[PDB]
Amino acid sequence: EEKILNREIGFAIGMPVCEFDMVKDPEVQDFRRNILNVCKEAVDLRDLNSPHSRAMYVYPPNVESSPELPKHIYNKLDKGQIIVVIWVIVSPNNDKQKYTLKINHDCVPEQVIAEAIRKKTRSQGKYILKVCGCDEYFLEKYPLSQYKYIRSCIMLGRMPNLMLMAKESLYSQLPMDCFTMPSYSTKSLWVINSALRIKILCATYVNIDKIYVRTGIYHGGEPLCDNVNTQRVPRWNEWLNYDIYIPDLPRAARLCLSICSVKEEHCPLAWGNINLFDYTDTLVSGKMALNLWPVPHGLEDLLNPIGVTGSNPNKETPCLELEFDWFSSVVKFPDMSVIEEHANWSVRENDKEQLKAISTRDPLSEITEQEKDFLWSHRHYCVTIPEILPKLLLSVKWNSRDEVAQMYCLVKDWPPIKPEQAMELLDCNYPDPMVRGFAVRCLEKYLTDDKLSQYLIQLVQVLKYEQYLDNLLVRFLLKKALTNQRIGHFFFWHLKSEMHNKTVSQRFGLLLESYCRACGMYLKHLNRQVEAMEKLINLTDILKQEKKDETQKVQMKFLVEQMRRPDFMDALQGFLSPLNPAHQLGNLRLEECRIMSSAKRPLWLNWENPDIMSELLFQNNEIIFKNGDDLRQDMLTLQIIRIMENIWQNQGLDLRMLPYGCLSIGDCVGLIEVVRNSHTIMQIQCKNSHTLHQWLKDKNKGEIYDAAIDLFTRSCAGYCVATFILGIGDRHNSNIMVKDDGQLFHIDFGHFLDLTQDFLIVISKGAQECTKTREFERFQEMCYKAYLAIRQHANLFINLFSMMLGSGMPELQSFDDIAYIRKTLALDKTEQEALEYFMKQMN
Numbered sequence: 052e053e054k055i056l057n058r059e060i061g062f063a064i065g066m067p068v069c070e071f072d073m074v075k076d077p078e079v080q081d082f083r084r085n086i087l088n089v090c091k092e093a094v095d096l097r098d099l100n101s102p103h104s105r106a107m108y109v110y111p112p113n114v115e116s117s118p119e120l121p122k123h124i125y126n127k128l129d130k131g132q133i134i135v136v137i138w139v140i141v142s143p144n145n146d147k148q149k150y151t152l153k154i155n156h157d158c159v160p161e162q163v164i165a166e167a168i169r170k171k172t173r174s175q176g177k178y179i180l181k182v183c184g185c186d187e188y189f190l191e192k193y194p195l196s197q198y199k200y201i202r203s204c205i206m207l208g209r210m211p212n213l214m215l216m217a218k219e220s221l222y223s224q225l226p227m228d229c230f231t232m233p234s235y236s237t238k239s240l241w242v243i244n245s246a247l248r249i250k251i252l253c254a255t256y257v258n259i260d261k262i263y264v265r266t267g268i269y270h271g272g273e274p275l276c277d278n279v280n281t282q283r284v285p286r287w288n289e290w291l292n293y294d295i296y297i298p299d300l301p302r303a304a305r306l307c308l309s310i311c312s313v314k315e316e317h318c319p320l321a322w323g324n325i326n327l328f329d330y331t332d333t334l335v336s337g338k339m340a341l342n343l344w345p346v347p348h349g350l351e352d353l354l355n356p357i358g359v360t361g362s363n364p365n366k367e368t369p370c371l372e373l374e375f376d377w378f379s380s381v382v383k384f385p386d387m388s389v390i391e392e393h394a395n396w397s398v399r400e401n402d403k404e405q406l407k408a409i410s411t412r413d414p415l416s417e418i419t420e421q422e423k424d425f426l427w428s429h430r431h432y433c434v435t436i437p438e439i440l441p442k443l444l445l446s447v448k449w450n451s452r453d454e455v456a457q458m459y460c461l462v463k464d465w466p467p468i469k470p471e472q473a474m475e476l477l478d479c480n481y482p483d484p485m486v487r488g489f490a491v492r493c494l495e496k497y498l499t500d501d502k503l504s505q506y507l508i509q510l511v512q513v514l515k516y517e518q519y520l521d522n523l524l525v526r527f528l529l530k531k532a533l534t535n536q537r538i539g540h541f542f543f544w545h546l547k548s549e550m551h552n553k554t555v556s557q558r559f560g561l562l563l564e565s566y567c568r569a570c571g572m573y574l575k576h577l578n579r580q581v582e583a584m585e586k587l588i589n590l591t592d593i594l595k596q597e598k599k600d601e602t603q604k605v606q607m608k609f610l611v612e613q614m615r616r617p618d619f620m621d622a623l624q625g626f627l628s629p630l631n632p633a634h635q636l637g638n639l640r641l642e643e644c645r646i647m648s649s650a651k652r653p654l655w656l657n658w659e660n661p662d663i664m665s666e667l668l669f670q671n672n673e674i675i676f677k678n679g680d681d682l683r684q685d686m687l688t689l690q691i692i693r694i695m696e697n698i699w700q701n702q703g704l705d706l707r708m709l710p711y712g713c714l715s716i717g718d719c720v721g722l723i724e725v726v727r728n729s730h731t732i733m734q735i736q737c738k739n740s741h742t743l744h745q746w747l748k749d750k751n752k753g754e755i756y757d758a759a760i761d762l763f764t765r766s767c768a769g770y771c772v773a774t775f776i777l778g779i780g781d782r783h784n785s786n787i788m789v790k791d792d793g794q795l796f797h798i799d800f801g802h803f804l805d806l807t808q809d810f811l812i813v814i815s816k817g818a819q820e821c822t823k824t825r826e827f828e829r830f831q832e833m834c835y836k837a838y839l840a841i842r843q844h845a846n847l848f849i850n851l852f853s854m855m856l857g858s859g860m861p862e863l864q865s866f867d868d869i870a871y872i873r874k875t876l877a878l879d880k881t882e883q884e885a886l887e888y889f890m891k892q893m894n
């Protein structure tokens with residue numbers, strides 16, 4: 052019954068569900084019950100047009116955001132038509148019959164199926180089209196070229212191989228749903244005319260010269276008043292008085308505490324932050340016990356205002372007891388109507404052009420005090436340039452309820468903005484729940500499932516910035532994960548991979564419980580993925596701890612011996628790939644598995660593809676399992692590279708990049724996708740500057756030589772511009788790879804935000820004066836055009852990095868690290884001045 056489901060949920064999260072039942076925090080138990088509404092809404096969407104809607108949840112169409120094909124992709128077609136191969140399995144003997152078609156690139160799946168039926172019968176709608184070799188279906192009326200698989204075949208010049216499948220054969224393999232409910236289911240702040248005061252009672256569990264408590268009232272990372280310290284001494288029993296009146300406290304105000312140690316040398320020993328208002332909008336009052344957190348490396352200040360809000364779950368840590376005033380009644384933050392009343396009671400063409408100039412500045416551009424006052428005075432004209440909302444929100448004095456009431460009214464009527472601009476309002480700079488709610492509404496209105504999958508790692512990270520467990524953002528993400536299994540799969544893994552981090556364990560564990568309770572039979576597939584990953588984690592841990600010093604041959608004897616055990620073989624075969632759940636990982640080809648001699652000794656694993664038409668895609672799936680490397684920098688880099696490639700493709704610049712798959716599975720463990728038929732530059736050379744070009748010529752003889760040199764040039768141009776803008780380091784010949792067809796790509800992105808002679812000879816087709824050929828001038832023009840196209844999209848890139856500021860990545864800890872892109876992109880210069888800077892760097 053439910054005891055079975057709770058056991059399976061526990062195995063998926065890596066935490067027994069009864070641990071959440073034991074938590075007495077009312078916010079936790081209210082979240083567990085209230086999130087079930089989102090679960091029921093999603094389950095209802097899945098049964099609305101059953102069984103078609105159930106099939107589209109499990110197998111959502113993998114399409115691009117727009118049906119429009121860029122001019123250079125349309126040119127690859129034959130008079131706007133594509134040649135596709137439709138296969139039909141005609142049992143007995145499982146015989147494969149192919150029928151080749153030449154149809155319009157925008158033909159919907161049913162038109163393609165009808166043309167195949169016509170060609171077959173020359174010797175109605177109870178069929179569906181599947182991609183040969185993987186579990187990807189064409190279940191929706193999109194034009195064929197919009198499907199990522201088809202669009203990928205047009206570019207690349209490959210032939211689409213689709214399979215005509217009986218609609219009944221798919222629907223019968225979909226499970227029967229249940230999603231049954233679990234067993235676990237005043238005065239106004241503005242009338243308190245006193246300044247804020249908080250009593251610091253005593254600190255337990257605090258085993259140099261003296262100790263004191265450092266405190267501050269903050270809104271985001273910005274202090275609303277000066278910091279106040281207790282006396283150096285531990286019992287203080289002292290009331291701390293702040294230079295801020297209670298009615299001027301914004302809704303997202305937080306108390307940031309610290310226990311510091313003392314030409315005096317100061318150092319934080321522990322920190323803790325408390326929301327001044329709880330999840331029910333009640334101002335905190337009475338006694339409270341805050342368990343503090345250890346100081347994170349590289350703090351550079353006495354307080355941590357960006358850090359997680361709430362008491363440390365480990366109650367055997369420094370515990371600071373605090374007392375808040377009680378004003379005889381429960382104090383609440385005023386209703387929207389009350390705020391509206393106070394906002395009302397609070398009240399040139401050269402100026403319109405000055406607002407337009409400020410509006411075009413990037414998120415990290417400095418806005419002077421004169422400019423902040425200028426923007427705020429024209430706050431009413433600003434509703435006509437909606438892209439200026441983030442700049443106007445920074446101009447508001449958040450410690451003044453008169454300005455904040457007026458800002459709330461402007462936000463309540465603000466025109467919707469594009470998702471990439473609404474995402475800037477979801478970083479740590481904008482804590483206000485009305486600002487954050489506006490941003491989420493822009494995402495619900497305009498974010499496609501495609502763009503949501505693309506920006507999933509920033510949206511899962513910005514969940515950590517929410518003040519409360521139940522919020523608009525988490526409800527949006529969970530609804531999208533519970534209505535699109537491809538989004539849900541990555542949503543599950545992005546959360547699970549952070550369960551080891553205790554500052555987020557509770558939030559992410561509760562969110563994972565809701566997801567597992569409502570995802571349906573996919574939980575059984577997720578448990579197989581989790582079980583295979585645990586066997587690999589334990590195995591690689593035994594290798595890196597016990598058999599660490601033994602030889603590679605002795606380690607391989609142990610790996611084969613461990614992997615041949617029944618328990619291990621069953622766990623490592625017949626499960627979906629966490630890198631791409633559309634790929635089934637059948638039988639382990641142990642003869643092809645090897646312990647690599649690369650850093651941290653990763654495992655190169657090879658599994659058969661059990662698809663009946665595996666030969667039309669890939670017969671074997673090769674994945675690297677790594678233990679010891681933080682795959683988060685690689686994830687972020689590969690996401691940026693994919694975004695840069697789309698910016699170039701859509702602007703008509705055909706620069707082909709290779710953002711191979713890379714999923715973090717937990718604490719410094721992950722999977723990396725093996726790009727088939729690839730070799731490092733060092734391998735090509737060790738099997739002189741003219742060696743590389745010679746290897747490419749031996750592999751590509753004839754007309755296919757021109758294609759390989761062109762592809763090499765384009766891919767090389769994209770990676771020179773990308774590595775430049777991002778400041779990617781350690782670009783030696785073992786981190787740069789090349790494919791049989793000339794495609795160049797980089798690997799291992801351990802360094803970010805800080806052209807060999809062999810490539811120039813390949814680009815110039817063999818010439819000795821390579822830097823003087825016309826091919827080098829054409830390659831140089833590609834770089835300049837690629838550089839300027841990305842510079843036009845700088846606000847997107849600055850925002851995608853800014854959302855990663857609180858991930859804990861050593862390379863991105865502050866806005867000074869993101870400022871590296873402001874220098875390479877030369878955002879403080881003109882388009883002509885930036886191109887000349889880039890040209891000087893290239894020359």
Ligand SMILES: Nc1ncc(-c2ccnc(N3CCOCC3)n2)cn1
Nearest residue numbers: 680685711723724725726729798799
């Ligand atoms: N973090 C990180 N990322 C990638 C690697 C790595 C090392 C060796 N080979 C590959 N390749 C094989 C060819 O396909 C592309 C992936 N990757 C290592 N560490």
